[PDB]
Design an enzyme around this catalytic site. Structure first.
Site, PDB file in Angstrom:
ATOM      1  CB  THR A  25       7.909   2.636  -3.652  1.00 49.57           C
ATOM      2  OG1 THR A  25       8.094   2.072  -4.955  1.00 49.57           O
ATOM      3  CG2 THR A  25       9.185   3.392  -3.237  1.00 49.57           C
ATOM      4  CE  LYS A  45       1.272  -0.440   1.656  1.00 48.22           C
ATOM      5  NZ  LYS A  45       0.895  -1.887   1.828  1.00 48.22           N
ATOM      6  CG  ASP A 135      -0.712 -10.833   1.145  1.00 51.42           C
ATOM      7  OD1 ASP A 135      -0.123 -11.919   0.969  1.00 51.42           O
ATOM      8  OD2 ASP A 135      -0.366  -9.783   0.590  1.00 51.42           O
ATOM      9  NE  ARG A 139       4.155 -11.712   0.527  1.00 49.67           N
ATOM     10  CZ  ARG A 139       3.828 -13.006   0.480  1.00 49.67           C
ATOM     11  NH1 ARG A 139       4.757 -13.949   0.654  1.00 49.67           N
ATOM     12  NH2 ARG A 139       2.583 -13.370   0.227  1.00 49.67           N
ATOM     13  CG  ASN A 140       2.632  -8.934   3.749  1.00 45.22           C
ATOM     14  OD1 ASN A 140       3.383  -8.108   3.237  1.00 45.22           O
ATOM     15  ND2 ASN A 140       1.834  -9.676   3.003  1.00 45.22           N
ATOM     16  CG  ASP A 153       0.526  -5.682   2.271  1.00 48.75           C
ATOM     17  OD1 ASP A 153      -0.593  -5.457   1.763  1.00 48.75           O
ATOM     18  OD2 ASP A 153       1.578  -5.753   1.601  1.00 48.75           O
TER      19      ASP A 153
HETATM   20  C1  LIG Z   1      10.244  -7.205   3.786  1.00 47.74           C
HETATM   21  C2  LIG Z   1      10.867  -6.076   3.494  1.00 47.74           C
HETATM   22  C3  LIG Z   1      10.323  -4.848   3.674  1.00 47.74           C
HETATM   23  O1  LIG Z   1       9.185  -4.761   4.114  1.00 47.74           O
HETATM   24  N1  LIG Z   1      10.985  -3.714   3.328  1.00 47.74           N
HETATM   25  C4  LIG Z   1      12.354  -3.698   2.789  1.00 47.74           C
HETATM   26  C5  LIG Z   1      12.739  -2.246   2.935  1.00 47.74           C
HETATM   27  C6  LIG Z   1      11.461  -1.506   2.632  1.00 47.74           C
HETATM   28  C7  LIG Z   1      10.379  -2.383   3.258  1.00 47.74           C
HETATM   29  C8  LIG Z   1       9.872  -1.833   4.536  1.00 47.74           C
HETATM   30  C9  LIG Z   1       9.225  -1.475   5.482  1.00 47.74           C
HETATM   31  C10 LIG Z   1       8.487  -0.967   6.611  1.00 47.74           C
HETATM   32  C11 LIG Z   1       9.140  -0.213   7.586  1.00 47.74           C
HETATM   33  N2  LIG Z   1       8.506   0.399   8.591  1.00 47.74           N
HETATM   34  C12 LIG Z   1       7.177   0.266   8.659  1.00 47.74           C
HETATM   35  C13 LIG Z   1       6.426  -0.400   7.714  1.00 47.74           C
HETATM   36  C14 LIG Z   1       7.073  -1.013   6.638  1.00 47.74           C
HETATM   37  C15 LIG Z   1       6.295  -1.811   5.671  1.00 47.74           C
HETATM   38  N3  LIG Z   1       6.882  -2.804   4.918  1.00 47.74           N
HETATM   39  C16 LIG Z   1       5.949  -3.420   4.157  1.00 47.74           C
HETATM   40  C17 LIG Z   1       4.697  -2.965   4.500  1.00 47.74           C
HETATM   41  C18 LIG Z   1       4.868  -1.935   5.450  1.00 47.74           C
HETATM   42  N4  LIG Z   1       3.857  -1.185   6.063  1.00 47.74           N
HETATM   43  C19 LIG Z   1       3.547   0.173   5.807  1.00 47.74           C
HETATM   44  C20 LIG Z   1       4.484   1.051   5.245  1.00 47.74           C
HETATM   45  C21 LIG Z   1       4.169   2.390   5.101  1.00 47.74           C
HETATM   46  C22 LIG Z   1       2.906   2.861   5.397  1.00 47.74           C
HETATM   47  C23 LIG Z   1       1.977   1.990   5.901  1.00 47.74           C
HETATM   48  F1  LIG Z   1       0.778   2.450   6.277  1.00 47.74           F
HETATM   49  C24 LIG Z   1       2.279   0.657   6.146  1.00 47.74           C
HETATM   50  O2  LIG Z   1       1.342  -0.188   6.678  1.00 47.74           O
HETATM   51  C25 LIG Z   1       0.297  -0.624   5.811  1.00 47.74           C
HETATM   52  C26 LIG Z   1       3.567  -3.410   3.816  1.00 47.74           C
HETATM   53  O3  LIG Z   1       2.467  -2.872   3.896  1.00 47.74           O
HETATM   54  N5  LIG Z   1       3.770  -4.451   2.988  1.00 47.74           N
HETATM   55  C27 LIG Z   1       4.953  -5.313   3.035  1.00 47.74           C
HETATM   56  C28 LIG Z   1       6.209  -4.472   3.142  1.00 47.74           C
END
Ligand SMILES: *CCC(=O)N1CCC[C@@H]1C#Cc1cnccc1-c1[nH]c2c(c1Nc1cccc(F)c1OC)C(=O)NCC2
Length: 305
Positions: A25, A45, A135, A139-140, A153
């Site tokens: 989430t 996250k 990975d 998406r990442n 990620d």
């Molecule tokens: C592909 C769709 C998607 O990623 N999202 C749909 C809405 C929610 C999500 C998002 C986002 C987002 C926004 N801003 C920064 C980072 C992210 C994020 N998405 C993903 C990852 C991240 N990275 C993340 C998030 C929070 C805290 C962290 F430290 C961090 O970096 C590790 C992720 O790690 N995996 C894939 C989705």
């Protein structure tokens, strides 16, 4: 050296869920550091369901934070409440997979080629820090601005020891359709198996977020690849672009391009983008840029082996 900043929960305000998925989430919020009145937009996250995995991800990110790179996501810190959460700067345009799917009719050739260059630059940085991501996928990859993307990620990422060239995995869940054949068959991951994943990521961008091997079960992938079959040529790709993807998917890992070579080749293509990608109405397309006066307006899969 790896150093984590533990951010006090009382420093965060306006936390709201952004979305959920295989990554866990993600919420958005405002981080107001102690002493300073700055309000920093952040993404937060949590994993699905666990503390072992998210702390390992924090460790990997802190391990590669110095000097850092503009195309690699950096951890601002962690928070300890009912769950351990990772904190990073909010990427207001979201993930590149959703971005390419939503803005297909305005993505020109210069953007696709520059994203390819930037992802290769971030991966080259990670390879120099002995990090195998494991990975890499659209998406990442996150969109800071339409012109600037970052790899995120590090949930499966591994640091290779000084005398180690490969990582041997156990039975954890892994993204089969983005993996090199040797990773599917022998659980072996290297910087050259990340190049295979990079080729799949490029195919995702060039098809505006199509699903690779759609409707084909993950258990059939190794046999499809041993028969010499590969993902199709995207209709916008000229042969030179498709041949780079095909080189990323060669059986012999050492015959695949290196990230250093992919930076050079995609940068060359980005210097004359309409020669390498054929997109109808390319010259008429526009996406918001921080140099635009009104930019502020815009700011308002894994299986058991
Ligand atoms: C592909 C769709 C998607 O990623 N999202 C749909 C809405 C929610 C999500 C998002 C986002 C987002 C926004 N801003 C920064 C980072 C992210 C994020 N998405 C993903 C990852 C991240 N990275 C993340 C998030 C929070 C805290 C962290 F430290 C961090 O970096 C590790 C992720 O790690 N995996 C894939 C989705």
């Amino acid at each position: 050296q790896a150093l984590l900043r533990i951010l006090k929960e009382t420093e965060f305000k306006k936390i709201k869920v952004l979305g959920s998925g295989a990554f866990g989430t993600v919420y958005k919020g405002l981080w107001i550091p102690e002493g300073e009145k700055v309000k920093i937009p952040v993404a937060i996250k949590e994993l699905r369901e666990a503390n072992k995995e998210i702390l390992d991800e924090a460790y990997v990110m802190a391990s590669v934070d110095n000097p850092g790179n503009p195309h690699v996501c950096r951890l601002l810190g962690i928070c300890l409440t009912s769950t351990v959460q990772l904190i990073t700067q909010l990427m207001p345009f979201g993930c590149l997979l959703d971005y390419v799917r939503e803005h297909k009719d305005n993505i020109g050739s210069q953007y696709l080629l520059n994203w390819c260059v930037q992802i290769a630059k971030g991966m080259n940085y990670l390879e120099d820090r002995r990090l195998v991501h494991r990975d890499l996928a659209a998406r990442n990859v996150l969109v800071k601005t339409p012109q600037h993307v970052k790899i995120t990620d590090f949930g499966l990422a591994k640091l290779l020891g000084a005398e180690e060239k490969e990582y041997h995995a156990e039975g954890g869940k892994v993204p089969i359709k983005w993996m090199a054949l040797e990773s599917i068959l022998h659980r072996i991951y290297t910087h050259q198996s990340d190049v295979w994943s990079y080729g799949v990521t490029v195919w995702e961008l060039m098809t505006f977020g199509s699903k690779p091997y759609d409707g084909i079960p993950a258990s059939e992938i190794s046999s499809i690849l041993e028969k010499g079959e590969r993902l199709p040529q995207p209709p916008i790709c000229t042969i030179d672009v498709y041949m780079i993807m095909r080189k990323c998917w060669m059986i012999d890992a050492d015959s695949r391009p290196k990230f250093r070579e992919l930076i050079i080749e995609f940068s060359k293509m980005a210097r004359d983008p309409q020669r390498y990608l054929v997109i109808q109405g390319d010259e008429r397309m526009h996406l918001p840029s921080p140099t635009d006066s009104n930019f502020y307006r815009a700011l308002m899969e894994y299986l058991i082996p």
